[PDB]
Design a protein around this ligand. Sequence first.
Ligand SMILES: Nc1nc2c(ncn2[C@@H]2O[C@H](COP(=O)(O)OP(=O)(O)OP(=O)(O)O)[C@@H](O)[C@H]2O)c(=O)[nH]1
Ligand SMILES: Nc1nc2c(ncn2[C@@H]2O[C@H](COP(=O)(O)OP(=O)(O)OP(=O)(O)O)[C@@H](O)[C@H]2O)c(=O)[nH]1
Ligand SMILES: Nc1nc2c(ncn2[C@@H]2O[C@H](COP(=O)(O)OP(=O)(O)O)[C@@H](O)[C@H]2O)c(=O)[nH]1
Lengths: 33, 428, 51, 433, 434, 23
Amino acid sequence: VNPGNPVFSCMLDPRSLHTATSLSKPKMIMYKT
Amino acid sequence: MREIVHLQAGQCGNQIGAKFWEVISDEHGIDPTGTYHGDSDLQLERINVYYNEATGGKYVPRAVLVDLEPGTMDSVRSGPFGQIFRPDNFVFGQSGAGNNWAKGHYTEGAELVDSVLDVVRKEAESCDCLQGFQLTHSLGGGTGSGMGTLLISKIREEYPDRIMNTFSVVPSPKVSDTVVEPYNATLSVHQLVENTDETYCIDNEALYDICFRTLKLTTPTYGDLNHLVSATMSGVTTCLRFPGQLNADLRKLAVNMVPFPRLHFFMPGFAPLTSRGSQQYRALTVPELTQQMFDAKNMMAACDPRHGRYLTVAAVFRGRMSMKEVDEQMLNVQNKNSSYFVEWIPNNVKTAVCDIPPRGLKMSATFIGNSTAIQELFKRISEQFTAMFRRKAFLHWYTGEGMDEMEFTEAESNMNDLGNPVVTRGAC
Amino acid sequence: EDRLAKEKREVEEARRQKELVENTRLGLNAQITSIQAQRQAARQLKEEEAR
Amino acid sequence: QRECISVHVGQAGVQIGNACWELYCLEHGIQPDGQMPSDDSFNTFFSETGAGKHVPRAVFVDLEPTVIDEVRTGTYRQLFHPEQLITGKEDAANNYARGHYTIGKELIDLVLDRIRKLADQCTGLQGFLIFHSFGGGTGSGFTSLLMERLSVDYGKKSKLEFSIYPAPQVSTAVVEPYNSILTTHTTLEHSDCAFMVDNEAIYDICRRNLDIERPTYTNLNRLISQIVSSITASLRFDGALNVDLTEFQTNLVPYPRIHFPLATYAPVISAEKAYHEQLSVAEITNACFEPANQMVKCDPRHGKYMACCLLYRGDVVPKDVNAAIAAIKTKRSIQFVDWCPTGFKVGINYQPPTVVPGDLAKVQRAVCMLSNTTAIAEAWARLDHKFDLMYAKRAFVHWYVGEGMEEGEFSEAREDMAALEKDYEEVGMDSVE
Amino acid sequence: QRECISVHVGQAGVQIGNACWELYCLEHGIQPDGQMPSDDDSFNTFFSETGAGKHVPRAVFVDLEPTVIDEVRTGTYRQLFHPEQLITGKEDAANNYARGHYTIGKELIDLVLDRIRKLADQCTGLQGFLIFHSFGGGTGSGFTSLLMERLSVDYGKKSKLEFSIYPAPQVSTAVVEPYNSILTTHTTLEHSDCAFMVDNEAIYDICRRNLDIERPTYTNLNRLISQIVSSITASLRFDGALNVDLTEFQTNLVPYPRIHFPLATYAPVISAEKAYHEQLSVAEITNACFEPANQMVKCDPRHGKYMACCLLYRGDVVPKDVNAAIAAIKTKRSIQFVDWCPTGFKVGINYQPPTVVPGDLAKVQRAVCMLSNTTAIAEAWARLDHKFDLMYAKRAFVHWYVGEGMEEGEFSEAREDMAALEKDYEEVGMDSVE
Amino acid sequence: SRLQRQCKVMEGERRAYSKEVHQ
Ligand SMILES: Nc1nc2c(ncn2[C@@H]2O[C@H](COP(=O)(O)OP(=O)(O)OP(=O)(O)O)[C@@H](O)[C@H]2O)c(=O)[nH]1
Ligand SMILES: Nc1nc2c(ncn2[C@@H]2O[C@H](COP(=O)(O)OP(=O)(O)OP(=O)(O)O)[C@@H](O)[C@H]2O)c(=O)[nH]1
Ligand SMILES: Nc1nc2c(ncn2[C@@H]2O[C@H](COP(=O)(O)OP(=O)(O)O)[C@@H](O)[C@H]2O)c(=O)[nH]1
C-alpha cells in the first residue's frame, strides 16, 4: 500500500519472477511450496 | 476451512486495524475494491480466513468496526483501502466514550454492544469452524477498553470454545496520553485476563524506539508505526492461510505457549526489519534473522527480557529455509543465553514455518515471547493506579457512571494478584 | 528494488519539507509586505497632520 | 454530525465571538455573508440552511444594545440569524443582581427558547461553549442564570466556559470582586469546565512577543479566538489523535469542584521574528511552560500542575511531541502533583494555523497548552482579599441588595470561597498515608 | 553537534563580537543577510538553522548601556541576529563593578539566562561557552562576574573559555580599572574555567611594528582578536590532522585549579606589502610566536618560566615540520621551561587556511595560534596590585562602591585572595629540590 | 447503608454460575 513502509513492499513484476530447469516447468518463485 | 473476524474498536483499533487490512490485502492480491488482481493461485486457495466472497469477485473483508463517536469511522472510509468494508460492519454511536472505562462498559456502551453482537453473530454464522476472533484496542482509554471489554466478554460468554488473539497497545512507561490512563487500564486488564486466550501487548514507546533506533525512520507518522503492528498480527495467522511445513494455527500457539491459564499476555516482534541504508549491508539467513529476532530491540514491548525470565516463546518463521538452520539457531540461542529462559519447562522455544514468505522478502518471522518480565509494565500501571485510588483523584467521573470504589480495588487486586503469579512461577 | 523504493520515500519527505517551507516563505513575505504597507500609511498620516 | 452550541454573553463574549467567527469563516472558506464559494467539516459550528447558506450555531446575548447592533450593522450582518442576536432594553449596569435576578426574566426565556431549536437542529449534541467575563453584571449574572437553566435542561451535556479573569493588578471596575465571587459561587455547582483567560497576562504577552507597543481588544480577542479555534479543531477536522470536548474535560478535573484550567498559546511570534527561529516541536513545548506566556497572570513556580492537555495543530510529528514531553517531564522546575504521574495529554490535528490579516505570524505548528494548576489558589486568595476589604464596610452592597440581591448571599459566597481555598490546600499538600 | 555558545558582554565584548561574527560570516560563506549562497555541517557549531536555512548566530549580545547594540541593530547585520537575541539595558554601569554586579544586574540577569537557556536548548550536545569581556568598565566587570556565577551554578560541568581584555600597565581608559579588575578576578577565580588574557598595549605595539599601520583603531584591534578567536575555535569547525577541542585546551593549558590564565599571540600578522618578501615556513612562524615582541600582552616572557604551550597551526602546515620547529625551540636556550613539565608544546593541525576580511591582514597559507601558560604573568599581576594598593591606601573612589550597596569587606577579601594568587604564582615557579 | 454493591456483584456472579450450569 506504501512503497516506503518499514517492512517490505515491492512492485517488481511477479510473473517474470519464475525459473525453470532442464527437466522441469517454470515454477512461480515467490509463492511456491 | 477456518475463520477469524477482526473486531476493531476506537481510534486505536480503527487506524491499526485499517493498516491490518491494507497489509493482508496486498499479501493476498485483493485490490482496493475487492477484485483479485493478484498472481499466484496459492493466494486465493485460502482467503475464506479473512475475506467473505461477494457475488462478483469482490472478496469483502469480514471486519466489524465499533466506534462510539462517528469520527475515526470517517477516517477508516476515506483511507485508500478503506472502501472495502461492508456498510453494516461500521457500527457508529454518535456520543463519546469520553475516555472513561466506565462510559463504555456501562453507559454509551450497552446501547451499542447489542448492535455490535448482531454484526458479529451474522459474520460468525457464515463460517465452517469459527476458529476464533481478533480485537484491536488501546487498553488505556475508552472506546478501546470500555467497548473492547464489553465486546470481548459478550464474545467469550456466547461462543465458548474459540480463540481471541487481542493486539492491545498497553499504556506506555515513559509519557502517557490520557490522565486516566492508569484507571482505564486496571479495570481493563482485570477483564482481558479472565476472558481472552492470547494478548500481544504492543506498547507504543517500543514502536517509537524501533522507528529511530533500528529503522532510522526520521519523520515517523502514526502510519509507519502501524505497519510494524500489522506485520506481527499477520505472521501469527499465516499458517492458517498460505501452506508450509511445521504448520501451527492459533490454538497451537496458545496450547504451546500458555503455561498456566493466565500467563497469556505475550510480547510481539517482526524479523527482517532492517533500515533505509543498512539493508544493502545486511545478508538475510536464519543466523542473522535470529540475532535480530531475539534482539530485545525488536521485541515491541517495554520489559527488556534481560530483567526477567522467559516462560514460553514461539517464532512463526516464513520463507524457504532449512529446518536444520532453524532448529539450530533456536537451540544455539537457547544455550548461550540460559539464565533467562526458565528451566521448569524444557524445550522452551517453539518453531513454525509457513513456506510462502512476505511479498518482497526472502525470509521472515514473528517472535511472540511470554516473558515473566512483563511484570514491569504491569507493576507501573499498578503503582500508578495506586497513588490514584488513594487520594481519590479523577474518580468523580467513573464513580458517577455507576462504578463503586470496590469495582476498582477488585481490579487492582487482580493485576497485583496477576503480578505475583508471574514471580511465583517466575522463580523455580 | 526495495532499497530504491525506500529512497523514493526519502525523496517524498524531501518534497514535503520543500513545499511546506516555501509555503511558509510566501505567506510570511505577504505578512511583511502588509506591515510595511501599514508603516507607509503611518508616515503619510504623520506628514498630513504636520501640514 | 457532532455539534456544540456557542453562546456569547456580555460585551466581552460578543466581541470574542466576532473575532472567533471571523476566524472560523476564514478557516472554512465561508464568505462573510454566509454563502460559501465552492462537507463533514463545516457541520459542527455551522448549520446549512437547506439551500445555500451556513448560519452559525451561536447565540449572542447582551442585556443592553449597541454591542449586538455593531454586529447587526457591520460586515457579519448577513451571517447570523436576526433572532439569535438577543438584546435587552436596559443595561445590567455592572450589577450581579441585574444580571441574575431583576432584569434576567425579560431575556432568559427567549434565550432558552432559542437554545432549544439549536438543540433540535442537531443530530448529536455534544456541548456548549459559553463566552463571558467575571467582571460586568451581564457576563456574571446572565451567565449564572443561563447555567442554572442549562443544568436543569441539558445536564448530561458538557459546558465549557471562557471566562475573562478579574485582573490581579489593573482592573477596570470597583465591583469586579463582588461580581466575580458571586458568579463563581453560582457556576461552581453548574459549570463543567471553565477555562480562564486573564487580561493582564495578555497585556504582557502583546508587548513581549507580538512587539505591538499599542495593542487593544482587537488583538486580545483575536488571540483568544486563536485559543478557542485551536481547541475546537479536533472535532472540526480529522486528526491523528482526535479529541472531544468531553475528553478535554475528563482529563483536566481531578475532583468535582476543581474545574478552572489556564490556557497558553504557542507561536505568539510577530511576523518579523520567525525568520530566525525553528518553531520546532520541542521548542514550542518549551515555550509553553515558560512562566511568562501564561494567559493568566500567575506564577506557576508557587504551585503544582495537576493535569495538562497539549493540542498540537499543523504538521506536528507526534513522536517529536513524545520527545518534547519526555524533555519536559525531567526538568526540576516544572513540578507536578505526586498523585498524578500521567500529566501531558496529546491531541494531534493535521490542520495548519490559518492567518487572519493582522499580527500573528503564519506557523505550521501550534500547540495550545491547557493546564490545571494549584497556582490559581493564590489568585483566588488575592480575589478573596479584594472581597474582604469591601465587604468589611458595606461598600456598594446597597446597590445590590436594593435590586433583588440579599445581604445573606454574600455570606455563603464568602464561605464557599473559603471552602475552595481549603480544597486547593488539600490537593496541594503531599500524600503521606 | 559540537555546538559552542558565544556571549559578548560589555562594549569591548560587543565590538569584538562584531569583528568575530563578521569573520565567521566571511569564512563559512554566510552573507550578512543570513541566507546561504550555496550555489556540509561546517556551520553547525556557531551558526544554527531555521526554515529555508536563514543562518542565525548563537551569540548573546549584552550591554547594560544602549546605543552600542543599536549600531549593530541598525547597521549592515540588522537581520543576521535574532531581533530580541540582542539584549539592551537602559542604565550605564558607569565604570563600576559594584553597579554591574550589585544594583543594575537583576533587571537583566534573569532575561540573559533565559536566552542562554533557550540557546543551549537549541543544541544537541554543547561543547562550551566563549565569554568576551574586559577587566575595565562596569558592565564588563560586574555583569561577567554575576554571569559566571549563574552559569557555574546552572551548567556546572561545562567548559567556559573566556577572552578577557587586560588592564594595561600604561595606557588606561578609566581610573578605577584596578578596582574593577581585582574585584572581578576575585569573583571569577573560582568560576572561570579558562581565561585567555589579551592586553591592548601589545596589540597596539605590534600594529605599529609589523602591520605597518601608524593610524589603526579598534576595528583593526578587534579584527586581530577576531582572527585569534577564529584560530582557537577552528578544529571544531573543520577537519584537521590533529583535531583539538575546547576540553582538550582545558586539559592542556592549565595544571592547577587557579593558574588558568593563558597568554595568546598570533602568527603571520604580516602586512601584504610585507608578505611577498617572506618565507612563510612552519619554523619561522614558531620562532615569531616565541619572539618576545609579538605577544598580545605587554609582559616580558624572559622574566619567567613557561608552564604549558599549545600551538594551533592552520593551513598548508606539515605535521612533521611542526616536529622540526618544536625540536628547534626545545634546543634553543632562552625559551626556558619549568622542570616539572618537560612536555611543553601541544600540536594542533587544521587544513583550512585563514580567510581574510577586507582590511589589514594578508593572503597567508599558514597561521599558528599560540596559547602559552607562563609564570611571567606574576609581574603584571603585582603591577596591577601596586596600583590597587596605592589607590586603596587613601580610599580613592570607594564611596560609589559602598553607597550603591556592596560592603567594604569585599576589597579586603579581594586583596587577601590576590595575595594568595601571587603566592601561588611564586610557588609554581621555582625548580624542585626534594 | 447503600447495599447496592452487594446485590449488584452477587447478582452478577449468581446469574453467571446459573448460566454456565444451564450450558
Ligand atoms: N477581549 C475583550 N475583553 C473585554 C472586552 N470588554 C471587556 N473585556 C473584559 O471584561 C472586563 C469587564 O468587562 P465585562 O465584564 O465584559 O462587562 P460587561 O459584560 O459588558 O457588563 P455590563 O457593564 O453590564 O455591560 C474587563 O476587565 C476586560 O478584561 C472586550 O470588548 N474584548
Ligand atoms: N577591541 C576593543 N577593546 C575595547 C573596546 N572598548 C573598550 N575596550 C577595552 O576595554 C577597556 C574598558 O572598556 P569596557 O570594559 O568594555 O567598558 P564598558 O563595557 O563599556 O562598560 P560601561 O562603560 O559601563 O558600559 C578599555 O580600557 C579598552 O582597552 C572596544 O570597543 N573594542
Ligand atoms: N499502532 C498504532 N497506534 C495508534 C495509532 N493511532 C493512535 N494510536 C494509539 O492509540 C492511543 C490512544 O487510544 P485511545 O485514547 O484509547 O482511543 P479511544 O479508544 O478512541 O479512546 C495513543 O496512545 C496512540 O499512540 C495508529 O495509527 N497505530
